[PDB]
Amino acid sequence: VSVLTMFRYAGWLDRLYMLVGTLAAIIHGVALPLMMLIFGDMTDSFASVGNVSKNSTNMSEADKRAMFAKLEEEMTTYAYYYTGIGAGVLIVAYIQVSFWCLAAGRQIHKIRQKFFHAIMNQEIGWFDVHDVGELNTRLTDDVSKINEGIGDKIGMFFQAMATFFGGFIIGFTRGWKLTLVILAISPVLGLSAGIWAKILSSFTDKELHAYAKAGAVAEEVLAAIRTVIAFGGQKKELERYNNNLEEAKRLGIKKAITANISMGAAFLLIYASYALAFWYGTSLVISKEYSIGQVLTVFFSVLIGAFSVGQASPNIEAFANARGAAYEVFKIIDNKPSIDSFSKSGHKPDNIQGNLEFKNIHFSYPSRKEVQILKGLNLKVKSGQTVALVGNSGCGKSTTVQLMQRLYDPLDGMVSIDGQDIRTINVRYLREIIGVVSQEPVLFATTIAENIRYGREDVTMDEIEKAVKEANAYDFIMKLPHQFDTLVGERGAQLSGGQKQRIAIARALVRNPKILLLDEATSALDTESEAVVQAALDKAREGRTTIVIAHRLSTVRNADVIAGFDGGVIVEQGNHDELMREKGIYFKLVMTQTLDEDVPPASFWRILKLNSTEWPYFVVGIFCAIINGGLQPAFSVIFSKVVGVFTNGGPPETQRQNSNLFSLLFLILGIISFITFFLQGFTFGKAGEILTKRLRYMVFKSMLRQDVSWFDDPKNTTGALTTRLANDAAQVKGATGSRLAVIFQNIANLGTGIIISLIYGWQLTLLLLAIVPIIAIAGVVEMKMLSGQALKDKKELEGSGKIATEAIENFRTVVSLTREQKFETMYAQSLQIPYRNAMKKAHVFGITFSFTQAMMYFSYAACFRFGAYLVTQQLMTFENVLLVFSAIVFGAMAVGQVSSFAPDYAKATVSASHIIRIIEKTPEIDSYSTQGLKPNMLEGNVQFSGVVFNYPTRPSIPVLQGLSLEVKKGQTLALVGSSGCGKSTVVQLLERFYDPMAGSVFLDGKEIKQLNVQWLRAQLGIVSQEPILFDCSIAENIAYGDNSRVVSYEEIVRAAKEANIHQFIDSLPDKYNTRVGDKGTQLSGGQKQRIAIARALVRQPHILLLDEATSALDTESEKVVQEALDKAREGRTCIVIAHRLSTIQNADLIVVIQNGKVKEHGTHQQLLAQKGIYFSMVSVQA
Incomplete structure (x- = not known):
């Protein structure tokens, strides 16, 4: 050694x-x-x-x-x-x-x-x-x-x-x-x-x-x-x-x-x-x-x-x-x-221009975590042309560009820039003729002068000047104290991301390429910065060969040839109209952007x-x-x-x-x-x-x-x-x-x-x-x-x-x-x-x-x-x-x-x-x-007045602002919000996980503030979006013992009988007294959600809290759980939340909550007669 x-x-x-x-x-x-x-x-x-x-x-x-x-x-x-x-x-x-x-x-x-x-x-x-x-x-x-x-x-x-x-x-x-x-x-x-x-x-x-x-x-x-x-x-x-x-x-x-x-x-x-x-x-x-x-x-x-x-x-x-x-x-x-x-x-002939000819390319995933991601490709792009590519995916266009370089080599085929291939052309030379305008915004720790200076170290301020004016970057540099010599600390702080890309464009202008591969250089932008950046891209071409990938139908309209791909293999070619006539990839995008x-x-x-x-x-x-x-x-x-x-x-x-x-x-x-x-x-x-x-x-x-x-x-x-x-x-x-x-x-x-x-x-x-x-x-x-x-x-x-x-x-x-x-x-x-x-x-x-x-x-x-x-x-x-x-x-x-x-x-x-x-x-x-400890101290009539909420993370923007509701005993209060997350938070503030900042909630006139923790869970039952079991026998799972709860075999039988989960338990040896494996990894969601209901009714709630009790369920799995809910309920106040409407089609009081703000509230048949928000949501189900 x-x-x-x-x-x-x-x-x-x-x-x-x-x-x-x-x-x-x-x-x-x-x-x-x-x-x-x-x-x-x-x-x-x-x-x-x-x-x-x-x-x-x-x-x-x-x-x-x-x-x-x-x-x-x-x-x-x-x-x-x-x-x-x-x-x-x-x-x-x-x-x-x-x-x-x-x-x-x-x-x-x-x-x-x-x-x-x-x-x-x-x-x-x-x-x-x-x-x-x-x-x-x-x-x-x-x-x-x-x-x-x-x-x-x-x-x-x-x-x-x-x-x-x-x-x-x-x-x-x-x-x-x-x-x-x-x-x-x-x-x-x-x-x-x-x-x-x-x-x-x-x-x-x-x-x-x-x-x-x-x-x-x-x-x-x-x-x-x-x-x-x-x-x-x-x-x-x-x-x-x-x-x-x-x-x-x-x-x-x-x-x-x-x-x-x-x-x-x-x-x-x-x-x-x-x-x-x-x-x-x-x-x-x-x-x-x-x-x-x-x-x-x-x-x-x-x-x-x-x-x-x-x-x-x-x-x-x-x-x-x-x-x-x-x-x-x-x-x-x-x-x-x-x-x-x-x-x-390497060695280059010193080519003036470059027409890209792609002949029989087939290539696999670069990390080989999928095999063969290009099925073929024949593409001939000459100078003076603008070819646009569109697809079923964004990946297969990025692949062609990665291959175009000497970063990866194509397993089959070769790309011939001029007479030379891609291995008779010098690497240093290859880069200088190849401009790339990428989607990610350039990062640098230094002044705007140094950032041009990394581009070539031979660049004179005269060339700096023409560059930034043509890339329309000549606005912000004057605005910043110290002109071009302004420091950008960290990895961006002075400049914004759109401005970063503009500088990179200006940087490529000093390179003078005769190839540009434009990867989402006019996409994922504001309408204003698209127009600015577009102009810069328009003036940077003076007759250059370019290949443009964008998701903007306007720039694919100015391409001389638009080419359809299935996500990696070429199918269509011709002008814009020919594709739209075939009803091709281009036309597919047209309708997708409406x-x-x-x-x-x-x-x-x-x-x-x-x-x-x-x-x-x-x-x-x-x-x-x-x-x-x-x-x-x-x-x-x-x-x-x-x-x-x-x-x-x-x-x-x-x-x-x-x-x-x-x-x-x-x-x-x-x-x-x-x-x-x-x-x-x-x-x-x-x-x-x-x-x-x-x-x-x-x-x-x-x-x-x-x-x-x-x-x-x-x-x-x-x-x-x-x-x-x-x-x-x-x-x-x-x-x-x-x-x-x-x-x-x-x-x-x-x-x-x-x-x-x-x-x-x-x-x-x-x-x-x-x-x-x-x-x-x-x-x-x-x-x-x-x-x-x-x-x-x-x-x-x-x-x-x-x-x-x-x-x-x-x-x-x-x-x-x-x-x-x-x-x-x-x-x-x-x-x-x-x-x-x-x-x-x-x-x-x-x-x-x-x-x-x-x-x-x-x-x-x-x-x-x-x-x-x-x-x-x-x-x-x-x-x-x-x-x-x-x-x-x-x-x-x-x-x-x-x-x-x-x-x-x-x-x-x-x-x-x-x-x-x-x-x-x-x-x-x-x-x-x-608390007094009397069942006379509850009606089930929960008052909510000026109730505000925001997560314990403070820059999350309150999602309840000015909310007041009421729900009277034996009525299901449904909640539905097409925006926001004002759904889950209501169930949570009532559970007192996080106390409302301001406003108060009364459960009949008894405020949430003074409620004993113990008494609070003896009037509340929860069915979580994730039910979770502990590694312990099934009998202790159907009802878990407190120090104020009696669990008995007969009771958990009745519990399993109402919960409709008794089906699986019967077939399991020893019935209720069994334990299988670990936790609840053995048992499906449907079995588990039934066990969560079965846990609830032990406490004898008068208020049921359902956190997604009709979502994360499909077909019969949904129906069987719903049956278990329906029997569980004894005419009890309920809060049923989800954006799925299925059991909202019998909900006594339907509430449309928009961002802490109630829009419409009321009975199904009335709201159904309205042409408002609730009904619009119902129409869009169909």
């Missing part, structure tokens, strides 16, 4: 830098065990000096002089080891970053410019395959990955290995026993982590299967939310959603449980291996002699080396992902896959407020983070005391202390950490669990208690709500997991470290905080400079992609052809600034990482440097020195955890905000109870 070789087109200096980066990376990684190699020689001599001090007990005069002089003489050489490596890691750092920038910069910039060229030079192919807009997003997002993949990540890979494999060499040579053991634990640790990954993967899918069910309930309810309201089953659908929530939590705790075993047992396996390494290391000294203390510290480096392999792995995956995404479309980048269509190199979510305020710890309210105890948990925090240094303290008694003293007692301490290194760490780790796991697990319940519960009830623009907006979509229930509840589990974790690292460095610092001699304390806050600050401040270059980089690429998205959204740019290379020139400069900036961040990023390694050696140097010196003369001990080194590594793990928890606090605050805004509510439907 070739992912940098051929990929970089084997660039000379690209290959050059690639070896230089590897070489500098080896020698960076080797150095790291080489520093610790130094720590071991320095450990040896000091022990040996100290050994001699303890064995004397008489000398301590001469020993105070010379032995310590020697340690100071070695210390100066040591200093130069640490410095020498220090200078080395600096230089070589800068080297590894150049790879990250300098190499990649000239490359991506090269890949991009040839890529952008290869799309225009392959013409059609790129446009065919996938979808532009979405296509150019992923690609500009992909080009940044390439930089990451050929960036220093490879260099970090080689570095990682140089520390592993290169370390292990020196470990292994200089002694083979401790190595053997250190390799022996490598598969045990790898076996365990492989069970881990299997547990993770398995339990995730299980959780998902649970939460799918909860999602599946959430999907249908929220989509169906108005419907679920209408039957009053809010509280029920809620109760089912709680069952699914019950399952998703029991799988929740087991996942948290098993995870806590993995994480616990993992630190156990670390501490075990670590103790076993040290123990076998000691048994070879005391009773034997195998280590002086040099190799022991180096074997510790072989343990650092394996941890490097684990850090390497993300670069490997970062590369895997860089490669795989680029390399698939790299195949498409290299070569032209269409060599059929090309923009470049809330606010993602606002700025954000959460300020409302997370822990909302969390704590629903928490009662678990204070032992919080306490456990503190003692498990402080548990971490002790492992190091014990370790310090180990090597301390291991160095000094003779053979008697040393074995016993090492054994004693070994058992202690186990019991204090391994045994306790597992216990306490699992207490903290029990706490943030059960917290994140019970939060998942309350949060999802208290949302879903709030969703039923609120209405209007919390799901009636296209950014509050149903899916978007379900997605919220997912992400927020998943997230809070990680939110609670981060708190105890932060307390753990707080005490772990700061807290205990101070306590450890007090038993120091406090020169060491001083020396230590000249390191720790600074190494921390170098790591946080690195991240602040990093992200600053990253922001500006994203910003740069915005402007470069933005002028790119203009070209690619236009397929029609290849038609000019000229402006392909002109655009890429403008790209080259636009892309030149981020290139130069890439060179700027090489030095900056170079220096940052350089200082970062500069602080590592500077730390170790000054640690041991100042750690000895004055101190050795007086009193100095092995202890406190590894505890300093431990405190150093504490400064690292702090930063690492904190930058990690920086986006957790973010995504949590956002989710905590979503949950707050929902609860704030807008409540027109909530729950209520205000």
Whole structure:
């Protein structure tokens, strides 16, 4: 595979830098065990000096002089080891970053410019395959990955290995026993982590299967939310959603449980291996002699080396992902896959004029989603003629024009322009002679001068002047401030669409074509702009060959030959009259034309407020983070005391202390950490669990208690709500997991470290905080400079992609052809600034990482440097020195955890905000109870007075304006409107989905405003235009149970008997108690609409609301439903809406509502005697 070789087109200096980066990376990684190699020689001599001090007990005069002089003489050489490596890691750092920038910069910039060229030079192919807009997003997002993949990540890979494999060499040579053991634990640790990954993967899918069910309930309810309201089953659908929530939590705790075993047992396996390494290391000294203390510290480096392999792995995956995404479309980048269509190199005779002769053309759909869409074609058009084409479709004329170009090639036939065919003619030349006036209005981001200037870059203002005057575009340019030089921002804002087309026409006048293909250039226009544009088209011909497609019979009257087509194959030819005489296509046309979510305020710890309210105890948990925090240094303290008694003293007692301490290194760490780790796991697990319940519960009830623009907006979509229930509840589990974790690292460095610092001699304390806050600050401040270059980089690429998205959204740019290379020139400069900036961040990023390694050696140097010196003369001990080194590594793990928890606090605050805004509510439907609860408080006499309505979307124009009606008890109020949508809205405002803005509605004198929600659906029944079932048994479907409804077998039988759906139910096994499949996808509309009626009469309505109860039905399906309605009705008030008149032919009071305004109203036979609006509608049925 070739992912940098051929990929970089084997660039000379690209290959050059690639070896230089590897070489500098080896020698960076080797150095790291080489520093610790130094720590071991320095450990040896000091022990040996100290050994001699303890064995004397008489000398301590001469020993105070010379032995310590020697340690100071070695210390100066040591200093130069640490410095020498220090200078080395600096230089070589800068080297590894150049790879990250300098190499990649000239490359991506090269890949991009040839890529952008290869799309225009392959013409059609790129446009065919996938979808532009979405296509150019992923690609500009992909080009940044390439930089990451050929960036220093490879260099970090080689570095990682140089520390592993290169370390292990020196470990292994200089002694083979401790190595053997250190390799022996490598598969045990790898076996365990492989069970881990299997547990993770398995339990995730299980959780998902649970939460799918909860999602599946959430999907249908929220989509169906108005419907679920209408039957009053809010509280029920809620109760089912709680069952699914019950399952998703029991799988929740087991996942948290098993995870806590993995994480616990993992630190156990670390501490075990670590103790076993040290123990076998000691048994070879005391009773034997195998280590002086040099190799022991180096074997510790072989343990650092394996941890490097684990850090390497993300670069490997970062590369895997860089490669795989680029390399698939790299195949498409290299070569032209269409060599059929090309923009470049041909040859023309230089033809003056062109007579089009089309001989035997047959061609298929360009996307091959239909085969053969032209059955033949013989067309001979000479110059001086105007041929008009007409059809049965608009598509087959567009096809001939697309073929006419070199955009597609005709499978059979050839179009001969002059003597030349369509492949002995040059592409560049083909375009210049071919004018196109298309229907879509030209888009541009720039001034009117530049827009002519894309036409030819050789155009003089004199030619600009004659152009616009002849295209009658010379009006608007004067009107606009700044004349021709007026900016048009966006993609049109200054100019209107008709004016856009005029400019394009003026643009073609500078081309001087001798072919014009006019595709609806005088259609889909106002009467005024048709006449203007027509004139321009008339003056642009002076004897040109043209082919005109229009839907205007006047322009097809001036064509010399009009040609009939069946939608792709020619049938008729001759003048206008000959066709009209045949009664052809031309004549056919003649007769045909005769809330606010993602606002700025954000959460300020409302997370822990909302969390704590629903928490009662678990204070032992919080306490456990503190003692498990402080548990971490002790492992190091014990370790310090180990090597301390291991160095000094003779053979008697040393074995016993090492054994004693070994058992202690186990019991204090391994045994306790597992216990306490699992207490903290029990706490943030059960917290994140019970939060998942309350949060999802208290949302879903709030969703039923609120209405209007919390799901009636296209950014509050149903899916978007379900997605919220997912992400927020998943997230809070990680939110609670981060708190105890932060307390753990707080005490772990700061807290205990101070306590450890007090038993120091406090020169060491001083020396230590000249390191720790600074190494921390170098790591946080690195991240602040990093992200600053990253922001500006994203910003740069915005402007470069933005002028790119203009070209690619236009397929029609290849038609000019000229402006392909002109655009890429403008790209080259636009892309030149981020290139130069890439060179700027090489030095900056170079220096940052350089200082970062500069602080590592500077730390170790000054640690041991100042750690000895004055101190050795007086009193100095092995202890406190590894505890300093431990405190150093504490400064690292702090930063690492904190930058990690920086986006957790973010995504949590956002989710905590979503949950707050929902609860704030807008409540027109909530729950209520205000009504008297008497069936004497209704007549069924619904008054409507000055009632206005407009959708929750405000620029929709009210469709009820000044409406007042009345309908008395036991009369059907029909409604019919040949304009508007004033039909459905009446039924809706009465259902109170959306409260009328003004006017009032009374149902007898009791206003809509004060109606209890519950009582409202106990006097109302609805038959929707879409009936929808829930996945539940059929008996629960015929009548759904509320808490105030009794459903019984006998009742739903009677219900099915009236509903005439009992026919199908009888034939289904078990009658009413059956369930088949899922939802209502098994059962036809007709069966379902019967079930919706059957649901209604449960509530015992006195007012029936029929939303299309006689539409979406045909033949018998209509009749059988109507029978079910007719029996359903007991002399009840009804609102029957639809524009179909069928059951309006017995409607007691027929109302013609025009746009909120009633025209005629009244009995059928009276209205039928009128010759007005109602009757006219009746006449036009016949």
